[PDB]
Design a protein around this ligand. Structure first.
Ligand SMILES: [Cl-]
Ligand SMILES: [Cl-]
Ligand SMILES: [Zn+2]
Length: 304
């Protein structure tokens, strides 16, 4: 059994976003929209239900742990259900939660050499936290092969490179490296059950689709309905391109997901401006129709 807990299902900013009065966030606050509040994207993985691997540490971490009881097993006066943290990139929305866990150090943190460089220079979390009882103990994710985190010996992680997209603050923002962004294949080696996790997905090539065909559950970027969704809502001028493949239209994730009728399909990392958030929207209805689920905070998935 592989347990996947959705701690946060929204894109950067969360839903509603603090400074946003777009149709979704305003409507949420007005009480006129049927929608559920979401914290920033983050999952936790277990092979036993007791020992948990956190995938990304969002700014909303404190409320996310609070809302998931197994994160506090209460086996000592100071205790946590978090046994390791895996980072897929060095973005602020995926790493900032580590500061909120400093009274719990040491932590085993898994990340690539490139992420580790960002996090010892431009956003020096490792250097800052070394001053709290030994800080973060780095475990290198190599860009080929697999890794096993000993707290969950039955989960085998196979990371796959996604393109570029280093954060604004990174000394190598203009100089993209393999290692900057990862998706994960996670396998329960007891059952052969496989999760394909790609919350940040710009492009789907040949290798990608073949991996996806091997998986039983596809947990994939659901950031924007349309490439220009920010401009349509009036809240910015950046496009999906940002490195997110929008749901709709040619080469979009729904067209891609059509090739995958057997797999469980879940959209996660959903922008505050995405119409799929509105429970009554035609876009939400189109997702239900194609057999695709919209992640929510507190969603529990059981794989095989
Ligand atoms: Cl503002
Ligand atoms: Cl960032
Ligand atoms: Zn908004």
């Amino acid at each position: 059994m592989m347990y996947i807990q959705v701690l946060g299902s929204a894109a950067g900013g969360g839903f509603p976003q603090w400074n946003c009065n777009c149709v979704n966030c305003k409507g949420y606050r007005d009480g006129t929209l049927k929608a559920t509040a979401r914290t920033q994207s983050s999952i936790a993985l277990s092979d036993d239900g007791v020992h948990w691997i956190l995938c990304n540490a969002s700014p909303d971490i404190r409320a996310q742990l609070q809302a998931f009881a197994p994160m506090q097993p209460a086996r000592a006066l100071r205790d946590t259900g978090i046994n390791a943290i895996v980072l897929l990139d060095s973005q602020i929305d995926h790493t900032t939660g580590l500061l909120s866990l400093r009274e719990g150090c040491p932590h085993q943190v898994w990340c690539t050499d490139m992420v580790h460089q960002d996090l010892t220079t431009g956003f020096p979390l490792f250097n800052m936290l070394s001053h709290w009882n030994g800080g973060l103990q780095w475990n290198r994710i190599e860009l080929e092969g697999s890794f096993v985190i000993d707290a969950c010996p039955n989960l085998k992680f196979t990371p796959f490179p996604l393109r570029s997209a280093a954060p604004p603050y990174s000394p190598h923002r203009f100089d993209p490296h393999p290692g900057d962004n990862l998706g994960l294949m996670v396998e329960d080696t007891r059952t052969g059950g496989k999760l394909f996790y790609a919350p940040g997905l710009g492009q789907v090539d040949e290798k990608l689709l073949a991996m996806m065909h091997g998986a039983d559950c596809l947990l994939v970027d659901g950031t924007l309905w349309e490439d220009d969704e920010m401009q349509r809502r009036g809240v910015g001028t950046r496009t999906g391109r940002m490195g997110h493949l929008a749901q709709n239209g040619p080469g979009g994730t729904l067209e891609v997901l059509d090739g995958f009728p057997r797999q469980r399909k879940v959209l996660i990392h959903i922008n505050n401006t995405n119409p799929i958030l509105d429970e009554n929207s035609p876009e939400r209805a189109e997702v239900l129709r194609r057999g695709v689920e919209v992640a929510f905070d507190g969603m529990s998935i059981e794989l095989l």
